[PDB]
Symmetry: C5
Subunit: 57 residues, 5 copies
């Protein structure tokens, strides 16, 4: 009965995420955020090169 | 005693439905993902409008 | 309940919670709607901008 | 009796290690994220193709 | 039974949940789902940048 009522309780509820641990954010940074930084930098380089091709004498 | 073994069992058997995250998580997530996507999107708009229209993309 | 019960419960519950792993269900509608605004819609705009770029680059080779 | 107060404190004292998500989650996440990454990736590679092809010709 | 469901669910929804380092099982899935595609996108973008710069700097 306990295993069932607990599972029923766990699946009935909703879960609000707090701030993640320092360990999670370190993992997420390498998995996602650092890559986004590099993609932003690469893209801004490309934009600036294209703009400079339009503006250069 | 037995309360630890059956509880782990219940926890692993269950599935967990995320609610809206806390203001704290969302503010972290906005910095780690959403704000960067905005800058990337705005940069690609700039690229496109310069290449296509020879004008500056504006927000 | 006694303090000794309280301590056992806290230690047993925390140990069980950290021993287990958590399989995510379909998120609630509030989460998926938030995530769509936070992430998915921005990826769509990025994707659409690239499609316009590709279309124009390919076309100029007319 | 004293259960929900002690339970809340335990739930918030622990940290949570995510497992492989359910099939419903991954099916959802694929539509919400990964399918769009694939489309973005495909469009970038087409752009690389064109710029390379012009270089070779 | 009624009370247990009631107070346990009340507690679960009142608490907030701090993510640990995810399991290797989750990161393996998330790598396929996200991080590998981010890698590929970055590599293509970098190739595009380098070739547009290469043509600018050529001869």
């Amino acid at each position: 009965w306990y295993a069932r009522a607990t599972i029923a309780a766990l699946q009935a509820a909703e879960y609000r995420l707090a701030m993640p641990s320092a360990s999670y954010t370190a993992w997420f940074t390498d998995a996602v955020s650092d890559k986004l930084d590099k993609i932003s930098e690469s893209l801004n380089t490309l934009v600036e090169c294209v703009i400079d091709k339009r503006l250069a004498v």
